[PDB]
Amino acid sequence: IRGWIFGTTLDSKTQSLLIVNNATNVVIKVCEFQFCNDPFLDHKNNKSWMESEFRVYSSANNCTFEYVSQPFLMDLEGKQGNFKNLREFVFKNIDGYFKIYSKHTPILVREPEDLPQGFSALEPLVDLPIGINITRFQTLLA
Amino acid sequence: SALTQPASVSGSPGQSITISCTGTSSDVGGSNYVSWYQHHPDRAPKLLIYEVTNRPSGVSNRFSGSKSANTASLTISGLQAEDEADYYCSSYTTTSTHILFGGGTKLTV
Amino acid sequence: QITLKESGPTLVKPTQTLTLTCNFSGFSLNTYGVGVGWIRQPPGKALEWLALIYWDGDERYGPFFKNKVTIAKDTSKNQVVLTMTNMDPVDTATYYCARHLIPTIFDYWGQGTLVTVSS
Amino acid sequence: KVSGNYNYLYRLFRKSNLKPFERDISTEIYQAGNKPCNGVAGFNCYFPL
């Protein structure tokens, strides 16, 4: 997984949210974004994990909000097996405000699938006050 | 146009004298924006009234104005040799942005 | 401080067209809320409003002279150009270019130029 | 302005009342009647603003 980009009309005439988590930035940008049918970032030589085609939003109209924050604890390169790490997020929408809660647990003892039966909490990551309707967003892994 | 103004007014120096510009209430509308300019010969006119009984910076307190039902009256106190000029009325209108006032020349002796 | 200056030919043949310029110096016309207009006064009679243009490229002409006059602005050289057509001996007049505001209709007037029609 | 100002816009037609604190705007064509509407507006098609 890389980052979540989302608007409403996919044409850079209506404002939209840009969340990018490539290597060290976490950039949040409220600006119009022209979206596509199939914007892709993972595709790279089919074996090399790179954010190829970083530019999936072609154009913009008027940018208002900008916020920079630290990245998370991920791994490097691409390989299959021994999926120790677990992440869990919850996204909520209250009166325009958009709140995200996150939790990351490493070295999960249980096998693939086999949802862990251990109690866990979620600390408040961040709220963002955009003030639009949200029923259409999608993650863009790389 | 449809707007008029008496041209000549006479008086005596040291006293007060008034002139008026008159038209139709419908064309000028409810909102007045009465304005008055002065023009002595051989250089461009300037503004002496821009709002109802109002005068901008560079004041001459002898000036006065008053907006009646369909007229705007300009009154001068303590006349001196500078009155012998032509004074123009100017008000916003509805159907067009016209004023088209003849202006008022002043006489004294 | 602002000076309004008028420039153009004084004698014009009636079949020929007329051009006039006003080289305002002392305000940036691009400021939001300020316009500039043209007023003519034929000798022997009252004045006569011609047209006016706004800061943001909005143009208002006289009710009769829409085709006769055309206006344009150049804030780089701080000038305004006006074109008048098929003029008449009655149209001969003294012309002024003037700053325009909403509360104060017209505040500062240029000195003006005489225009007469003959051969 | 003396000649009037026309650069200000306001929405008239929407399919439903919007939730509090909505900012985004869409300039797509609106159809009042049940007749399908595309391209240009007209009968039963009113411009949203």
Ligand SMILES: *[C@@H]1O[C@H](CO)[C@@H](O)[C@H](O)[C@H]1NC(C)=O
């Ligand atoms: C994160 O974004 C900043 C801002 O554009 C950029 O300078 C930086 O290189 C990015 N980090 C990457 C590409 O790893």
Ligand SMILES: *[C@@H]1O[C@H](CO)[C@@H](O)[C@H](O)[C@H]1NC(C)=O
């Ligand atoms: C890797 O991807 C780049 C960009 O898509 C492409 O130019 C290059 O030919 C690819 N190389 C291989 C070996 O697939």
